[PDB]
């Protein structure tokens, strides 16, 4: 599977039938049909004790891995029940600034989208989590081209180190709190992972307020390669899935 012509998202249904499932992600966030739910609690992000281990180019994107052996960087409150541990974060970006996000707002596409993956700590491990309807909690953040994000530079500078598929690099003392917007106002709905196995275990939490990154910050993302060393070069661009049919699901707003 990939993002090319012959292995693109339009093909994943053959290998992953759930592709056509009832709670597939990403989806379009219609802000007029969105339902302001007053029973929604405030989000509670606790990343002060976070522990980054490494950055890896897995062939479809780069992931910043974290130590999830203890409740170091957890997610609770909001639409959630119980505590969710951060295990990794990654991005989805476009070939141009007019595309890149997975989720759209009133059909509007952003340059990129950041997903912070957390798993329900009553399931013990991540592998168990992915067997439950409420197993995961992905925190989505939209990225727009504007001023540079200081807090993102460290990431930006290491990409040279992992240009191709299978490469990794030590990547400690990375504080995720610098990738967060000022406001924690969100939208939430029951979906799935936007990439294969496409498991329908995610409680999406897409924040309203986007983060701005510079042109040059984004430009470094587009230098990455899908391909592994010593193969023809396939630039890592447009690693996003088109929005899926809501299919009766309802999108709730905290604002
Ligand atoms: Hg599941
Ligand atoms: Zn993602």
Short mmCIF file of C-alpha atoms and ligand atoms in Angstrom, two decimals:
data_model
loop_
_atom_site.label_atom_id
_atom_site.label_comp_id
_atom_site.label_asym_id
_atom_site.label_seq_id
_atom_site.Cartn_x
_atom_site.Cartn_y
_atom_site.Cartn_z
CA UNK A 1 0.00 0.00 0.00
CA UNK A 2 1.18 3.57 -0.56
CA UNK A 3 0.03 6.95 -1.89
CA UNK A 4 0.94 6.46 -5.54
CA UNK A 5 -1.34 5.79 -8.47
CA UNK A 6 -1.38 2.02 -8.37
CA UNK A 7 -1.28 1.52 -4.61
CA UNK A 8 -3.12 4.66 -3.45
CA UNK A 9 -6.00 5.02 -1.07
CA UNK A 10 -8.42 4.11 -3.82
CA UNK A 11 -6.86 0.62 -3.68
CA UNK A 12 -6.64 -0.06 0.06
CA UNK A 13 -10.10 -1.62 0.09
CA UNK A 14 -8.69 -4.75 -1.64
CA UNK A 15 -6.16 -5.39 1.09
CA UNK A 16 -8.10 -3.76 3.94
CA UNK A 17 -11.86 -4.28 3.34
CA UNK A 18 -12.67 -2.12 6.39
CA UNK A 19 -11.63 0.72 4.07
CA UNK A 20 -15.36 0.92 3.25
CA UNK A 21 -16.42 0.54 6.83
CA UNK A 22 -18.94 2.50 8.90
CA UNK A 23 -16.53 4.67 10.94
CA UNK A 24 -13.63 5.50 8.60
CA UNK A 25 -11.39 8.53 8.86
CA UNK A 26 -10.68 11.40 7.81
CA UNK A 27 -13.98 13.25 7.28
CA UNK A 28 -15.13 16.78 6.43
CA UNK A 29 -15.94 18.94 9.43
CA UNK A 30 -19.14 20.78 8.59
CA UNK A 31 -19.10 23.54 11.20
CA UNK A 32 -22.83 24.29 10.67
CA UNK A 33 -24.02 20.71 11.17
CA UNK A 34 -21.47 20.22 13.95
CA UNK A 35 -23.28 19.82 17.30
CA UNK A 36 -22.32 22.04 20.19
CA UNK A 37 -22.39 19.56 23.11
CA UNK A 38 -22.33 21.22 26.50
CA UNK A 39 -21.61 17.95 28.33
CA UNK A 40 -18.16 18.03 26.82
CA UNK A 41 -15.43 18.47 29.41
CA UNK A 42 -12.29 20.54 28.83
CA UNK A 43 -9.33 18.74 27.34
CA UNK A 44 -6.51 17.79 29.72
CA UNK A 45 -3.03 17.46 28.13
CA UNK A 46 -0.15 16.52 30.46
CA UNK A 47 3.08 16.32 28.53
CA UNK A 48 5.39 17.98 31.06
CA UNK A 49 7.03 14.60 31.79
CA UNK A 50 7.26 13.43 28.19
CA UNK A 51 10.18 11.32 27.03
CA UNK A 52 11.11 11.21 23.30
CA UNK A 53 13.27 8.32 22.21
CA UNK A 54 13.64 8.49 18.43
CA UNK A 55 12.49 9.65 15.02
CA UNK A 56 11.95 7.11 12.24
CA UNK A 57 11.11 7.16 8.53
CA UNK A 58 8.78 4.17 8.14
CA UNK A 59 8.19 4.68 4.42
CA UNK A 60 4.84 6.47 4.64
CA UNK A 61 5.92 9.21 7.04
CA UNK A 62 8.22 9.99 9.98
CA UNK A 63 7.27 9.16 13.55
CA UNK A 64 8.58 10.63 16.79
CA UNK A 65 8.42 7.77 19.30
CA UNK A 66 7.86 8.11 23.01
CA UNK A 67 8.34 6.03 26.15
CA UNK A 68 4.87 4.80 27.04
CA UNK A 69 5.92 2.42 29.82
CA UNK A 70 4.50 4.82 32.43
CA UNK A 71 1.99 7.68 32.46
CA UNK A 72 4.53 10.33 31.37
CA UNK A 73 2.64 12.07 28.51
CA UNK A 74 -1.07 11.36 28.92
CA UNK A 75 -4.31 12.55 27.50
CA UNK A 76 -7.62 12.68 29.48
CA UNK A 77 -10.77 14.76 29.94
CA UNK A 78 -12.86 15.95 26.97
CA UNK A 79 -14.84 13.18 25.32
CA UNK A 80 -12.60 10.55 26.90
CA UNK A 81 -13.06 8.01 29.65
CA UNK A 82 -9.83 7.10 31.38
CA UNK A 83 -6.23 7.99 30.55
CA UNK A 84 -4.55 7.70 27.19
CA UNK A 85 -0.76 7.45 26.78
CA UNK A 86 1.21 9.18 23.99
CA UNK A 87 3.12 6.56 21.97
CA UNK A 88 4.00 8.66 18.90
CA UNK A 89 3.28 11.65 16.65
CA UNK A 90 3.60 12.04 12.87
CA UNK A 91 2.46 14.35 10.03
CA UNK A 92 0.59 14.27 6.72
CA UNK A 93 1.60 17.03 4.24
CA UNK A 94 1.05 17.97 0.63
CA UNK A 95 3.12 18.70 -2.51
CA UNK A 96 1.83 22.28 -2.32
CA UNK A 97 0.48 24.45 0.47
CA UNK A 98 -3.12 24.16 -0.75
CA UNK A 99 -3.32 20.45 0.29
CA UNK A 100 -1.91 18.17 2.96
CA UNK A 101 -4.42 17.79 5.83
CA UNK A 102 -6.60 14.71 6.13
CA UNK A 103 -9.54 16.35 7.88
CA UNK A 104 -11.06 19.37 6.12
CA UNK A 105 -13.08 22.23 7.66
CA UNK A 106 -16.08 23.23 5.53
CA UNK A 107 -14.14 21.51 2.71
CA UNK A 108 -11.03 23.60 3.50
CA UNK A 109 -7.70 21.77 3.25
CA UNK A 110 -4.59 22.71 5.20
CA UNK A 111 -0.87 22.33 4.33
CA UNK A 112 -0.38 19.58 6.86
CA UNK A 113 -1.90 17.77 9.84
CA UNK A 114 -0.21 16.53 13.02
CA UNK A 115 -1.56 13.40 14.75
CA UNK A 116 -0.58 12.62 18.33
CA UNK A 117 -1.47 8.94 18.95
CA UNK A 118 -2.52 7.86 22.39
CA UNK A 119 -3.82 4.47 23.59
CA UNK A 120 -6.14 3.53 26.52
CA UNK A 121 -3.90 2.54 29.44
CA UNK A 122 -7.14 -0.08 30.66
CA UNK A 123 -5.95 -2.27 27.80
CA UNK A 124 -2.33 -2.59 28.91
CA UNK A 125 -0.45 -2.21 25.60
CA UNK A 126 -1.06 -0.58 22.23
CA UNK A 127 -1.60 -3.90 20.45
CA UNK A 128 -4.57 -4.62 22.73
CA UNK A 129 -5.94 -1.11 22.35
CA UNK A 130 -6.39 -1.59 18.66
CA UNK A 131 -8.97 -4.32 19.48
CA UNK A 132 -11.37 -1.91 21.11
CA UNK A 133 -13.85 0.69 19.88
CA UNK A 134 -12.35 3.10 22.41
CA UNK A 135 -8.83 1.81 22.22
CA UNK A 136 -7.16 4.92 20.76
CA UNK A 137 -7.36 8.70 20.99
CA UNK A 138 -5.73 10.72 18.17
CA UNK A 139 -5.25 14.45 18.79
CA UNK A 140 -5.34 16.25 15.46
CA UNK A 141 -3.77 19.63 14.78
CA UNK A 142 -3.84 21.60 11.52
CA UNK A 143 -0.75 23.38 10.19
CA UNK A 144 -0.89 26.50 7.98
CA UNK A 145 1.93 28.34 6.19
CA UNK A 146 2.76 31.57 8.03
CA UNK A 147 5.37 32.30 10.71
CA UNK A 148 7.88 29.60 11.65
CA UNK A 149 7.26 27.41 14.66
CA UNK A 150 10.28 27.58 16.89
CA UNK A 151 9.17 24.51 18.79
CA UNK A 152 9.24 22.51 15.52
CA UNK A 153 12.81 23.41 14.45
CA UNK A 154 14.49 20.53 16.29
CA UNK A 155 12.34 18.10 14.28
CA UNK A 156 13.05 19.94 11.06
CA UNK A 157 16.81 19.71 11.52
CA UNK A 158 16.97 15.91 12.02
CA UNK A 159 15.12 14.98 8.78
CA UNK A 160 18.45 14.97 6.92
CA UNK A 161 19.33 12.08 9.23
CA UNK A 162 16.33 9.97 8.15
CA UNK A 163 15.85 10.89 4.51
CA UNK A 164 14.96 7.30 3.50
CA UNK A 165 12.90 4.32 4.57
CA UNK A 166 14.15 2.34 7.59
CA UNK A 167 16.38 5.11 8.92
CA UNK A 168 15.99 6.19 12.51
CA UNK A 169 17.90 8.50 14.90
CA UNK A 170 18.14 9.03 18.65
CA UNK A 171 15.73 11.83 19.48
CA UNK A 172 15.48 12.58 23.19
CA UNK A 173 14.45 15.61 25.17
CA UNK A 174 11.83 16.63 22.61
CA UNK A 175 8.97 18.59 24.26
CA UNK A 176 5.69 18.11 22.40
CA UNK A 177 3.99 21.01 24.21
CA UNK A 178 5.53 23.36 21.63
CA UNK A 179 3.42 21.95 18.81
CA UNK A 180 0.15 22.89 20.61
CA UNK A 181 -2.05 25.84 19.69
CA UNK A 182 -3.17 28.38 22.31
CA UNK A 183 -6.75 27.06 22.43
CA UNK A 184 -7.90 23.51 23.14
CA UNK A 185 -11.36 24.00 21.58
CA UNK A 186 -12.19 20.87 19.60
CA UNK A 187 -14.47 18.72 17.52
CA UNK A 188 -14.79 14.95 18.20
CA UNK A 189 -16.29 11.97 16.47
CA UNK A 190 -15.72 8.18 16.29
CA UNK A 191 -13.38 7.24 13.42
CA UNK A 192 -10.35 5.25 12.51
CA UNK A 193 -6.61 5.28 11.67
CA UNK A 194 -6.13 7.06 8.33
CA UNK A 195 -3.60 4.53 7.18
CA UNK A 196 -3.75 0.72 7.00
CA UNK A 197 -4.79 -1.55 8.97
CA UNK A 198 -7.43 1.27 9.16
CA UNK A 199 -8.66 -0.06 12.45
CA UNK A 200 -11.89 1.62 13.65
CA UNK A 201 -10.74 2.27 17.18
CA UNK A 202 -10.19 6.01 17.20
CA UNK A 203 -11.88 8.79 19.12
CA UNK A 204 -10.81 11.78 17.01
CA UNK A 205 -10.15 15.13 18.63
CA UNK A 206 -9.45 17.73 15.99
CA UNK A 207 -8.58 21.15 17.55
CA UNK A 208 -10.21 24.19 16.02
CA UNK A 209 -7.12 26.40 16.08
CA UNK A 210 -4.35 25.62 13.67
CA UNK A 211 -0.60 26.12 14.25
CA UNK A 212 1.43 28.10 11.74
CA UNK A 213 4.81 26.90 10.37
CA UNK A 214 7.10 28.66 7.85
CA UNK A 215 7.41 27.81 4.15
CA UNK A 216 10.91 26.55 4.81
CA UNK A 217 9.78 24.37 7.73
CA UNK A 218 7.29 22.67 5.41
CA UNK A 219 9.77 22.54 2.56
CA UNK A 220 12.02 20.24 4.62
CA UNK A 221 9.18 17.76 5.04
CA UNK A 222 8.88 17.51 1.23
CA UNK A 223 12.55 16.51 0.87
CA UNK A 224 11.90 13.17 2.58
CA UNK A 225 11.70 9.94 0.64
CA UNK A 226 9.22 7.06 0.61
CA UNK A 227 11.94 4.91 -0.89
CA UNK A 228 14.77 3.22 0.94
CA UNK A 229 18.45 3.91 0.26
CA UNK A 230 19.78 2.77 -3.14
CA UNK A 231 16.41 2.83 -4.91
CA UNK A 232 14.99 5.40 -7.28
CA UNK A 233 13.89 8.45 -5.34
CA UNK A 234 10.17 8.83 -4.54
CA UNK A 235 9.63 12.09 -2.70
CA UNK A 236 7.46 11.94 0.45
CA UNK A 237 4.57 14.19 -0.52
CA UNK A 238 0.78 13.92 -0.42
CA UNK A 239 0.72 11.22 2.25
CA UNK A 240 -2.91 11.97 3.02
CA UNK A 241 -6.22 10.18 2.68
CA UNK A 242 -9.30 11.84 1.20
CA UNK A 243 -12.23 12.48 3.53
CA UNK A 244 -14.66 9.62 3.96
CA UNK A 245 -18.43 9.49 4.21
CA UNK A 246 -19.69 10.35 7.72
CA UNK A 247 -22.36 7.70 7.34
CA UNK A 248 -24.78 8.81 10.09
CA UNK A 249 -22.03 9.57 12.67
CA UNK A 250 -22.35 12.94 14.41
CA UNK A 251 -19.60 15.51 14.95
CA UNK A 252 -19.76 17.20 18.32
CA UNK A 253 -18.12 20.57 19.17
CA UNK A 254 -16.82 21.76 22.54
CA UNK A 255 -17.55 25.34 21.53
HG1 LIG B 1 -11.05 -1.37 17.25
ZN1 LIG B 2 -1.94 10.18 10.86
#
